[PDB]
Tab-separated table of C-alpha atoms in Angstrom:
chain	number	residue	atom	x	y	z
A	1	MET	CA	-1.565	22.395	-44.383
A	2	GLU	CA	-2.037	26.451	-45.167
A	3	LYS	CA	-0.428	27.262	-41.714
A	4	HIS	CA	3.162	26.027	-43.047
A	5	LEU	CA	2.201	28.438	-46.476
A	6	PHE	CA	1.942	31.386	-44.487
A	7	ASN	CA	4.554	30.615	-42.071
A	8	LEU	CA	6.768	30.136	-44.812
A	9	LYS	CA	6.032	33.475	-46.535
A	10	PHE	CA	6.453	34.889	-43.350
A	11	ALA	CA	9.798	33.438	-43.280
A	12	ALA	CA	10.392	34.730	-46.552
A	13	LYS	CA	9.053	38.428	-45.779
A	14	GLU	CA	10.967	38.167	-42.352
A	15	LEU	CA	14.436	37.766	-43.303
A	16	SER	CA	13.493	40.403	-45.944
A	17	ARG	CA	12.887	42.717	-43.761
A	18	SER	CA	15.709	41.976	-41.604
A	19	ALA	CA	18.348	42.174	-44.408
A	20	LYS	CA	16.927	45.419	-45.364
A	21	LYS	CA	17.703	47.031	-41.549
A	22	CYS	CA	21.268	45.459	-41.556
A	23	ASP	CA	21.842	47.533	-44.895
A	24	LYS	CA	19.961	50.699	-43.594
A	25	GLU	CA	22.609	50.317	-40.633
A	26	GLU	CA	25.682	49.860	-42.959
A	27	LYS	CA	24.724	53.103	-44.784
A	28	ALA	CA	24.470	54.825	-40.854
A	29	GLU	CA	27.598	52.824	-39.741
A	30	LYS	CA	29.849	54.640	-43.078
A	31	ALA	CA	29.030	58.119	-41.684
A	32	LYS	CA	29.833	57.580	-37.802
A	33	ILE	CA	32.979	55.926	-39.373
A	34	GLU	CA	33.754	59.771	-40.568
A	35	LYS	CA	33.175	61.126	-37.793
A	36	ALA	CA	35.096	58.867	-35.798
A	37	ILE	CA	38.204	58.977	-37.761
A	38	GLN	CA	37.569	62.764	-38.105
A	39	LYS	CA	39.122	62.914	-34.477
A	40	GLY	CA	41.991	60.889	-35.576
A	41	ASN	CA	41.575	57.639	-33.274
A	42	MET	CA	42.336	54.855	-35.042
A	43	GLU	CA	40.340	52.339	-32.864
A	44	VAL	CA	37.395	53.464	-32.843
A	45	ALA	CA	37.745	53.896	-36.787
A	46	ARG	CA	38.880	50.321	-36.881
A	47	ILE	CA	35.824	48.626	-35.379
A	48	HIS	CA	33.168	50.684	-36.887
A	49	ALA	CA	34.636	49.749	-40.144
A	50	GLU	CA	34.765	46.503	-38.727
A	51	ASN	CA	30.971	46.486	-38.122
A	52	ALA	CA	30.050	48.466	-41.246
A	53	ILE	CA	31.777	45.234	-43.093
A	54	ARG	CA	29.871	42.868	-41.228
A	55	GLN	CA	26.376	44.190	-41.541
A	56	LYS	CA	27.006	44.034	-45.467
A	57	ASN	CA	28.401	40.568	-45.652
A	58	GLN	CA	24.895	39.902	-43.717
A	59	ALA	CA	22.968	41.929	-45.787
A	60	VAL	CA	24.152	39.606	-48.448
A	61	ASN	CA	23.659	36.219	-46.822
A	62	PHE	CA	20.103	37.025	-45.278
A	63	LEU	CA	18.709	38.597	-48.681
A	64	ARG	CA	20.352	35.363	-50.204
A	65	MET	CA	18.496	33.696	-47.920
A	66	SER	CA	15.062	35.618	-48.620
A	67	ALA	CA	15.734	34.361	-52.322
A	68	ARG	CA	15.948	30.622	-51.856
A	69	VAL	CA	13.117	30.674	-49.884
A	70	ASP	CA	10.636	33.023	-51.766
A	71	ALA	CA	11.153	30.533	-54.245
A	72	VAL	CA	10.104	27.345	-51.778
A	73	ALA	CA	7.367	29.491	-50.827
A	74	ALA	CA	6.259	30.582	-54.765
A	75	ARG	CA	6.248	26.292	-55.423
A	76	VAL	CA	4.210	25.698	-52.300
A	77	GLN	CA	1.974	28.423	-53.179
A	78	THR	CA	0.814	26.073	-56.527
A	79	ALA	CA	0.913	23.036	-54.911
A	80	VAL	CA	-1.975	24.203	-52.553
A	81	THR	CA	-4.271	25.955	-54.851
A	82	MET	CA	-3.248	22.497	-57.588
A	83	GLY	CA	-4.823	20.678	-54.988
A	84	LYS	CA	-7.815	23.208	-54.373
A	85	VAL	CA	-8.592	22.791	-58.308
A	86	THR	CA	-8.121	18.623	-57.808
A	87	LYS	CA	-10.341	18.288	-55.493
A	88	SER	CA	-12.961	21.324	-56.907
A	89	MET	CA	-13.037	19.523	-60.156
A	90	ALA	CA	-13.297	15.468	-58.572
A	91	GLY	CA	-16.609	17.532	-56.925
A	92	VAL	CA	-18.100	18.251	-60.091
A	93	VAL	CA	-17.114	15.215	-62.130
A	94	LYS	CA	-19.112	12.950	-59.287
A	95	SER	CA	-21.853	15.274	-58.687
A	96	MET	CA	-22.439	15.638	-62.813
A	97	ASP	CA	-21.939	11.554	-62.990
A	98	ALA	CA	-24.483	10.830	-60.233
A	99	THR	CA	-26.990	13.755	-61.916
A	100	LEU	CA	-25.783	11.830	-65.272
A	101	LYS	CA	-27.427	8.176	-64.143
A	102	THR	CA	-30.695	9.356	-63.798
A	103	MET	CA	-30.693	12.266	-66.280
A	104	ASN	CA	-28.868	9.607	-69.385
A	105	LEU	CA	-29.181	10.525	-72.370
A	106	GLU	CA	-32.335	8.528	-73.575
A	107	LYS	CA	-34.655	9.614	-71.211
A	108	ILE	CA	-33.644	13.437	-72.503
A	109	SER	CA	-34.080	12.621	-75.795
A	110	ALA	CA	-37.381	11.313	-74.995
A	111	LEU	CA	-39.006	14.304	-73.353
A	112	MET	CA	-37.922	16.519	-75.962
A	113	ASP	CA	-39.772	14.331	-78.711
A	114	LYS	CA	-42.711	14.730	-76.154
A	115	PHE	CA	-41.509	18.213	-75.798
A	116	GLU	CA	-42.651	18.931	-79.447
A	117	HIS	CA	-45.630	17.162	-79.422
A	118	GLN	CA	-46.619	18.859	-76.795
A	119	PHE	CA	-46.304	22.600	-77.932
A	120	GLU	CA	-47.103	21.449	-80.972
A	121	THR	CA	-50.465	20.486	-79.504
A	122	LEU	CA	-49.893	24.226	-77.558
A	123	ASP	CA	-50.263	25.679	-81.418
A	124	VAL	CA	-53.565	24.058	-82.357
A	125	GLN	CA	-54.984	24.720	-79.520
A	126	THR	CA	-54.149	28.365	-80.350
A	127	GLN	CA	-55.359	28.060	-83.958
A	128	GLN	CA	-58.977	26.933	-82.936
A	129	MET	CA	-59.625	29.415	-80.453
A	130	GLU	CA	-58.860	32.160	-82.611
A	131	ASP	CA	-60.983	30.338	-85.433
A	132	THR	CA	-64.303	30.447	-82.831
A	133	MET	CA	-63.193	33.746	-81.411
A	134	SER	CA	-62.612	34.961	-84.074
A	135	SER	CA	-65.859	34.228	-86.263
A	136	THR	CA	-68.349	35.089	-82.901
A	137	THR	CA	-67.342	39.203	-82.788
A	138	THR	CA	-67.070	38.995	-86.697
A	139	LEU	CA	-70.000	40.833	-86.989
A	140	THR	CA	-67.849	44.057	-86.048
A	141	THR	CA	-65.518	43.536	-88.757
A	142	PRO	CA	-66.786	42.911	-92.216
A	143	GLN	CA	-64.200	41.999	-95.239
A	144	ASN	CA	-65.339	44.885	-97.498
A	145	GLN	CA	-64.645	47.696	-94.881
A	146	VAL	CA	-61.394	46.200	-94.026
A	147	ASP	CA	-60.485	46.074	-97.701
A	148	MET	CA	-61.180	49.884	-98.793
A	149	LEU	CA	-59.795	51.057	-95.895
A	150	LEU	CA	-56.291	48.753	-96.345
A	151	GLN	CA	-56.842	50.278	-99.630
A	152	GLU	CA	-57.281	53.871	-98.615
A	153	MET	CA	-53.901	53.760	-96.785
A	154	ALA	CA	-52.351	51.666	-99.203
A	155	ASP	CA	-52.592	54.612	-102.660
A	156	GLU	CA	-51.592	57.311	-100.094
A	157	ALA	CA	-49.441	55.299	-97.552
A	158	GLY	CA	-45.990	56.998	-97.808
A	159	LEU	CA	-47.771	60.193	-99.387
A	160	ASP	CA	-48.274	61.842	-95.723
B	1	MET	CA	14.523	29.794	-27.307
B	2	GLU	CA	13.467	33.172	-28.314
B	3	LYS	CA	13.949	34.133	-24.986
B	4	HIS	CA	18.063	33.840	-25.450
B	5	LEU	CA	18.035	35.458	-28.847
B	6	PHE	CA	15.912	38.779	-27.072
B	7	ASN	CA	18.382	38.654	-24.442
B	8	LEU	CA	21.288	38.582	-26.442
B	9	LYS	CA	20.075	41.696	-28.557
B	10	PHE	CA	18.970	43.495	-25.802
B	11	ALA	CA	22.701	42.957	-24.191
B	12	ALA	CA	23.961	44.297	-27.542
B	13	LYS	CA	21.848	47.292	-27.529
B	14	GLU	CA	22.627	47.398	-23.828
B	15	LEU	CA	25.997	48.306	-24.211
B	16	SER	CA	25.662	50.573	-27.058
B	17	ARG	CA	23.261	52.610	-24.985
B	18	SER	CA	25.838	52.512	-22.242
B	19	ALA	CA	28.869	52.945	-24.515
B	20	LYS	CA	27.233	56.253	-25.796
B	21	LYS	CA	26.670	57.662	-22.190
B	22	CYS	CA	30.248	57.444	-21.831
B	23	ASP	CA	30.765	59.210	-24.808
B	24	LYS	CA	28.855	61.727	-24.115
B	25	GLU	CA	30.083	62.334	-20.265
B	26	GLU	CA	33.442	62.302	-22.118
B	27	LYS	CA	32.667	65.714	-24.320
B	28	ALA	CA	30.926	67.508	-21.063
B	29	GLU	CA	34.093	66.309	-19.194
B	30	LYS	CA	36.496	68.227	-21.635
B	31	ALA	CA	33.840	71.233	-21.255
B	32	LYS	CA	34.438	71.180	-17.347
B	33	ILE	CA	38.328	70.563	-17.350
B	34	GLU	CA	38.409	74.111	-19.250
B	35	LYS	CA	36.373	75.562	-16.288
B	36	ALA	CA	38.485	73.725	-14.016
B	37	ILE	CA	41.648	75.023	-15.284
B	38	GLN	CA	40.490	78.312	-15.843
B	39	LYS	CA	40.813	78.982	-12.083
B	40	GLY	CA	44.507	77.738	-12.456
B	41	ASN	CA	44.030	74.674	-10.042
B	42	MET	CA	46.252	71.965	-10.710
B	43	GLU	CA	44.597	69.026	-9.648
B	44	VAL	CA	40.971	69.293	-9.493
B	45	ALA	CA	42.299	69.646	-13.467
B	46	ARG	CA	43.932	66.584	-12.924
B	47	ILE	CA	41.290	64.481	-11.755
B	48	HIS	CA	39.203	65.391	-14.401
B	49	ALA	CA	41.659	64.748	-17.187
B	50	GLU	CA	41.699	61.629	-16.041
B	51	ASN	CA	38.019	60.911	-15.953
B	52	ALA	CA	37.569	62.123	-19.329
B	53	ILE	CA	40.577	59.914	-20.806
B	54	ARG	CA	38.507	56.750	-19.016
B	55	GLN	CA	35.562	57.699	-20.514
B	56	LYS	CA	36.748	57.607	-23.730
B	57	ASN	CA	38.585	54.630	-23.306
B	58	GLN	CA	35.056	52.611	-21.399
B	59	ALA	CA	33.700	53.940	-24.443
B	60	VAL	CA	36.120	51.593	-27.159
B	61	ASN	CA	35.980	48.822	-24.662
B	62	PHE	CA	32.151	48.592	-24.247
B	63	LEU	CA	31.898	49.525	-28.086
B	64	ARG	CA	33.878	46.684	-28.750
B	65	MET	CA	31.635	44.174	-27.115
B	66	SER	CA	28.490	45.753	-28.878
B	67	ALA	CA	30.464	44.791	-32.157
B	68	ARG	CA	31.307	41.226	-31.108
B	69	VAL	CA	27.754	40.477	-29.319
B	70	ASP	CA	25.942	41.875	-31.721
B	71	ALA	CA	27.550	39.560	-34.602
B	72	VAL	CA	26.796	36.234	-32.579
B	73	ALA	CA	22.950	38.358	-32.107
B	74	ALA	CA	23.198	37.822	-35.980
B	75	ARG	CA	24.223	34.470	-36.163
B	76	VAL	CA	22.105	33.092	-33.769
B	77	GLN	CA	18.828	34.804	-35.415
B	78	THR	CA	19.814	33.082	-38.606
B	79	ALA	CA	19.777	29.802	-36.825
B	80	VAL	CA	16.435	30.666	-35.260
B	81	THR	CA	14.686	31.727	-39.041
B	82	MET	CA	16.832	28.524	-40.743
B	83	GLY	CA	15.043	26.682	-37.735
B	84	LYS	CA	11.465	27.771	-38.506
B	85	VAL	CA	11.767	27.111	-42.604
B	86	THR	CA	12.765	23.391	-41.438
B	87	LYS	CA	10.408	22.530	-39.525
B	88	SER	CA	7.676	24.395	-41.980
B	89	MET	CA	9.455	22.697	-45.030
B	90	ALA	CA	9.237	18.874	-42.789
B	91	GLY	CA	5.913	19.943	-42.707
B	92	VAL	CA	4.966	20.692	-46.212
B	93	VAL	CA	6.683	17.391	-46.881
B	94	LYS	CA	4.728	15.650	-45.062
B	95	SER	CA	1.309	16.369	-45.296
B	96	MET	CA	1.710	16.650	-49.024
B	97	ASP	CA	3.113	12.996	-48.475
B	98	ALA	CA	0.441	11.436	-47.227
B	99	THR	CA	-2.078	13.270	-49.508
B	100	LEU	CA	0.124	11.941	-52.075
B	101	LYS	CA	-0.431	8.267	-50.856
B	102	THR	CA	-4.706	8.297	-51.583
B	103	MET	CA	-4.047	11.077	-54.268
B	104	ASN	CA	-1.112	8.617	-56.018
B	105	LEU	CA	-1.220	9.987	-59.773
B	106	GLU	CA	-3.185	6.500	-61.027
B	107	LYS	CA	-6.325	7.395	-59.648
B	108	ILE	CA	-5.949	11.145	-60.882
B	109	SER	CA	-5.138	9.935	-64.655
B	110	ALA	CA	-7.891	7.888	-64.223
B	111	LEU	CA	-10.312	10.705	-62.844
B	112	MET	CA	-9.320	12.872	-65.637
B	113	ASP	CA	-10.556	10.428	-68.464
B	114	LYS	CA	-13.195	10.214	-66.689
B	115	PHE	CA	-13.318	13.581	-66.838
B	116	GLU	CA	-13.083	14.186	-70.382
B	117	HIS	CA	-15.785	11.357	-71.008
B	118	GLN	CA	-18.008	13.171	-68.797
B	119	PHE	CA	-17.947	16.557	-70.355
B	120	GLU	CA	-18.267	15.020	-74.078
B	121	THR	CA	-21.146	13.726	-73.060
B	122	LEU	CA	-22.480	17.133	-71.971
B	123	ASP	CA	-21.394	18.349	-75.251
B	124	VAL	CA	-23.983	16.017	-76.735
B	125	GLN	CA	-26.380	16.720	-74.661
B	126	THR	CA	-26.132	20.018	-75.273
B	127	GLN	CA	-26.515	19.346	-78.939
B	128	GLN	CA	-29.504	17.263	-78.803
B	129	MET	CA	-31.408	19.139	-76.665
B	130	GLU	CA	-30.622	22.561	-78.918
B	131	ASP	CA	-32.181	20.169	-81.861
B	132	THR	CA	-35.568	19.563	-80.908
B	133	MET	CA	-35.518	22.942	-79.019
B	134	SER	CA	-35.091	24.492	-82.173
B	135	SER	CA	-37.191	22.865	-84.020
B	136	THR	CA	-39.859	22.885	-82.212
B	137	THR	CA	-40.327	26.864	-82.281
B	138	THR	CA	-39.021	26.622	-85.981
B	139	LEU	CA	-42.118	27.993	-87.517
B	140	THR	CA	-40.979	31.405	-85.864
B	141	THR	CA	-37.467	31.654	-87.956
B	142	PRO	CA	-38.093	30.644	-91.066
B	143	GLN	CA	-34.752	29.730	-93.421
B	144	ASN	CA	-35.757	32.151	-96.765
B	145	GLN	CA	-36.412	35.079	-94.281
B	146	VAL	CA	-33.175	35.035	-92.251
B	147	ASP	CA	-31.375	34.799	-95.801
B	148	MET	CA	-32.899	38.017	-97.119
B	149	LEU	CA	-32.083	39.795	-93.946
B	150	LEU	CA	-28.352	38.333	-93.522
B	151	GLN	CA	-28.026	39.578	-97.176
B	152	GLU	CA	-29.590	43.205	-96.990
B	153	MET	CA	-27.368	43.900	-93.937
B	154	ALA	CA	-24.751	42.279	-95.737
B	155	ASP	CA	-24.665	44.247	-99.038
B	156	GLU	CA	-25.190	47.648	-96.833
B	157	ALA	CA	-23.240	46.712	-94.272
B	158	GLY	CA	-20.297	49.331	-93.692
B	159	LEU	CA	-21.959	51.529	-95.635
B	160	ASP	CA	-24.251	52.876	-92.915
C	1	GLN	CA	22.804	72.700	-92.654
C	2	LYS	CA	22.748	72.671	-96.400
C	3	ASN	CA	22.577	69.140	-97.115
C	4	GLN	CA	20.388	68.681	-94.234
C	5	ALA	CA	18.061	71.390	-96.173
C	6	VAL	CA	17.879	69.263	-99.113
C	7	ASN	CA	17.248	65.718	-97.139
C	8	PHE	CA	14.028	67.367	-95.192
C	9	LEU	CA	12.919	68.907	-97.851
C	10	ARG	CA	12.851	66.116	-99.707
C	11	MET	CA	11.109	64.085	-97.304
C	12	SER	CA	8.083	66.845	-96.825
C	13	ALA	CA	7.360	66.422	-100.514
C	14	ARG	CA	6.998	62.762	-100.539
C	15	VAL	CA	5.095	62.513	-97.116
C	16	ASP	CA	3.153	65.805	-99.156
C	17	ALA	CA	2.343	63.121	-101.993
C	18	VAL	CA	0.923	60.325	-99.336
C	19	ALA	CA	-0.922	63.318	-97.377
C	20	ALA	CA	-2.643	63.988	-100.968
C	21	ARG	CA	-3.882	60.746	-102.073
C	22	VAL	CA	-5.076	59.935	-98.186
C	23	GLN	CA	-7.499	62.770	-98.738
C	24	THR	CA	-8.031	61.746	-101.927
C	25	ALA	CA	-9.128	58.310	-100.001
C	26	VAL	CA	-11.196	60.100	-97.048
C	27	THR	CA	-13.394	62.314	-99.082
C	28	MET	CA	-13.888	59.494	-101.846
C	29	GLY	CA	-15.255	57.783	-98.443
C	30	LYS	CA	-17.637	60.217	-97.509
C	31	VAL	CA	-18.775	60.090	-101.238
C	32	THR	CA	-19.364	56.381	-101.292
C	33	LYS	CA	-21.130	56.650	-97.876
C	34	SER	CA	-23.711	59.320	-98.799
C	35	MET	CA	-24.366	58.123	-102.053
C	36	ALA	CA	-24.891	54.672	-100.137
C	37	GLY	CA	-27.448	56.448	-98.221
C	38	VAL	CA	-29.448	58.307	-101.183
C	39	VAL	CA	-29.094	55.221	-103.024
C	40	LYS	CA	-30.991	53.244	-100.247
C	41	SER	CA	-33.717	55.996	-98.909
C	42	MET	CA	-34.241	56.445	-102.393
C	43	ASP	CA	-35.396	52.935	-102.813
C	44	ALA	CA	-37.571	52.760	-99.827
C	45	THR	CA	-39.234	55.585	-100.998
C	46	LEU	CA	-39.581	53.838	-104.586
C	47	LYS	CA	-41.120	50.859	-102.893
C	48	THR	CA	-44.512	53.070	-101.724
C	49	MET	CA	-44.046	55.137	-104.409
C	50	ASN	CA	-43.781	53.120	-107.407
C	51	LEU	CA	-44.449	54.795	-110.171
C	52	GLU	CA	-48.303	52.519	-111.348
C	53	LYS	CA	-49.486	54.395	-107.860
């Protein structure tokens, strides 16, 4: 499908370029007319005048085609990108669906209260551990000593 | 079909070039006439004058052919590019059609309400998850503490 | 030229007035911020320096 989009854009840019040439030729042809009629030739001056004119009207005609073809090119662009979005969206709806069948909310919620209970047990493990761990080395940290220390750095705390 | 377009443009540019030569020869031939009649020769001066003239009228004739042939060349150009646009357009109408038969709007719209329902379920999954997830670690974020904090940075907020 | 002199000079007046009040607004701003500063630093140094100690 892309192939046709690319050919349309190509045809558009094509028409623009050709129109551009015909216009350029038009200007050059004015110049050439002036050189011609400078001699006093009334025939060459004629067919040059003529080719100048046709170059200009061709410029109009081509450039018009460039317009309309460009428009269709735009809408085709929209059509393709729309296509991509549609496909990909179908993709997420499906994968998410078949992953919504085994992930259906009940199993999740269960997994979550299971979660609460779980790390709750983590916390009690922690607490227990730190009780025995702090009652084994506790000879090296009297309560009294810590009291007088904390007081020591209390009264003078911000005095430096 | 391109082959004939290319031969027409070729014939046009051909005629232009030959016309150009005949013109150049014309000027050179004026010069040569002057050299000739400088001696006083009334015969060489004749046939040179003659060839000068015919060179000029040939310039007219050729250049005229260049004009008209160029015109047909232009319209043929339009015909070809029109051809390309037509084919490619037929292409998009068809591919898009046979992709409009299995993509026919009803199935899409269905896919879309299915879409709403789907990500709706996503949101409830989210909400649930964050409830248990924020009620498990919630010991580490008292409500009171957050209140006094937010107030702390409320009163002085923009004072810096 | 003379009436323009009047007109411009009038604009100079009023714009100058607003300029003055804006000046007051800014300096007021500075004073407010800095004052908030002393109230706070002095406060958090009033918590560990509280009169009893």
